[PDB]
Amino acid sequence: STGSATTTPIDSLDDAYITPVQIGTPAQTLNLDFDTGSSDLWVFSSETTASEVDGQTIYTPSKSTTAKLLSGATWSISYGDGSSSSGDVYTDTVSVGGLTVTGQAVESAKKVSSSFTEDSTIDGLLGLAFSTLNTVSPTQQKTFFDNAKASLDSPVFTADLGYHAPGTYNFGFIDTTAYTGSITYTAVSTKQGFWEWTSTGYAVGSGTFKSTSIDGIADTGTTLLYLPATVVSAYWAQVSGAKSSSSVGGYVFPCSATLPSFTFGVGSARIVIPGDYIDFGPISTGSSSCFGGIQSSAGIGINIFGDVALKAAFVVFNGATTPTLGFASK
Numbered sequence: 001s002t003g004s005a006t007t008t009p010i011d012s013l014d015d016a017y018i019t020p021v022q023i024g025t026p027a028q029t030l031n032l033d034f035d036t037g038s039s040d041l042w043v044f045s046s047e048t049t050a051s052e053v054d055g056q057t058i059y060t061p062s063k064s065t066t067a068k069l070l071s072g073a074t075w076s077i078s079y080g081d082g083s084s085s086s087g088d089v090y091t092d093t094v095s096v097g098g099l100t101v102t103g104q105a106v107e108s109a110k111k112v113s114s115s116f117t118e119d120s121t122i123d124g125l126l127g128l129a130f131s132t133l134n135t136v137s138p139t140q141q142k143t144f145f146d147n148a149k150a151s152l153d154s155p156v157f158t159a160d161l162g163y164h165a166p167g168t169y170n171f172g173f174i175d176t177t178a179y180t181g182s183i184t185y186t187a188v189s190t191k192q193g194f195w196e197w198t199s200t201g202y203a204v205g206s207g208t209f210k211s212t213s214i215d216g217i218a219d220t221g222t223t224l225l226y227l228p229a230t231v232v233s234a235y236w237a238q239v240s241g242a243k244s245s246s247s248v249g250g251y252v253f254p255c256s257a258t259l260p261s262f263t264f265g266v267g268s269a270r271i272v273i274p275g276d277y278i279d280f281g282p283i284s285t286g287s288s289s290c291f292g293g294i295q296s297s298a299g300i301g302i303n304i305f306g307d308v309a310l311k312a313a314f315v316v317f318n319g320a321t322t323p324t325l326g327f328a329s330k
């Protein structure tokens with residue numbers, strides 16, 4: 001089997017991407033943020049504290065003839081910015097772009113933090129990291145991909161995120177028309193439960209490539225590109241007026257600037273992020289100071305190849321016995 005679903009930016013800045021997911025019988029379609037950095041499929045629901053729902057579409061398990069309460073199971077998760085959610089668990093039929101998994105754990109939110117409430121466009125998350133990170137207790141549950149894998153034509157999924165445009169998540173096949181040149185595969189460590197890999201270096205604009213190992217994770221659930229302070233300083237030094245602002249919380253730059261590209265290495269291959277991809281717009285409405293799309297990972301404890309990087313590539317998440325990651329230009 002295969003599946004193919006369009007993923008759409010939630011706003012004009014590509015702050016995140018949402019993908020329609022069918023849950024239950026009859027289908028209830030929710031727009032979920034596919035997150036290769038986490039391993040829980042959770043949704044706003046009829047069980048979510050009423051005051052914490054503000055425009056999201058909810059899953060109502062009582063209206064699904066295939067929903068079954070997973071007895072005694074609960075979940076609770078906290079993300080990189082301290083946002084959080086928790087609740088109970090059902091199993092139900094879940095379909096993505098024509099690919100169907102029966103008995104998928106659907107984690108129904110009883111509580112969500114303010115950041116989730118305040119974002120009406122995201123109805124929940126669909127985790128695509130390794131199932132070892134799933135938070136369901138006392139019996140850990142499998143991700144959608146892990147459940148589907150055996151049925152897939154090939155044990156892979158691909159992320160093809162758009163710049164200011166929709167893109168595609170495919171399951172079970174590689175669309176050879178969706179990229180240019182070849183796909184370069186690179187080793188993955190699953191020790192921390194992430195799609196963790198090592199970039200071979202970087203360049204800023206038309207500058208010389210610096211060969212240096214940068215360990216990081218491919219995280220579609222993170223908007224920006226977080227890299228070591230040395231690398232980030234070298235990038236922003238090429239932008240007149242750019243500065244790291246403690247008050248704003250990172251590098252900002254004059255909105256009048258034309259940004260240089262940023263290149264990262266995948267083995268001997270090179271992925272070029274155009275400068276425009278690195279502009280996240282005014283820091284506050286009407287400001288002429290803009291927020292940068294490349295930020296320091298210092299104090300995070302890990303580098304993050306988030307959407308800013310991933311959207312410049314066609315990315316293969318290879319879930320074979322020994323997982324690997326593939327990157328192609330597009």
Ligand SMILES: CC(C)(C)NC(=O)[C@@H]1C[C@@H]2CCCC[C@@H]2CN1C[C@@H](O)[C@H](Cc1ccccc1)NC(=O)[C@H](CC(N)=O)NC(=O)c1ccc2ccccc2n1
Nearest residue numbers: 015016033035037038078079080081083133221222223224
């Ligand atoms: C939960 C856990 C399993 C630990 N996985 C993680 O926390 C993973 C994996 C790594 C863990 C160690 C630290 C680095 C990454 C962070 N990621 C965070 C990853 O799972 C999570 C998914 C998510 C999506 C939507 C809304 C909330 C949360 N993204 C995040 O925590 C980051 C935080 C940030 N500001 O960088 N969220 C965003 O980049 C983000 C999401 C939505 C937005 C909407 C509008 C405007 C900006 C937006 N920014």
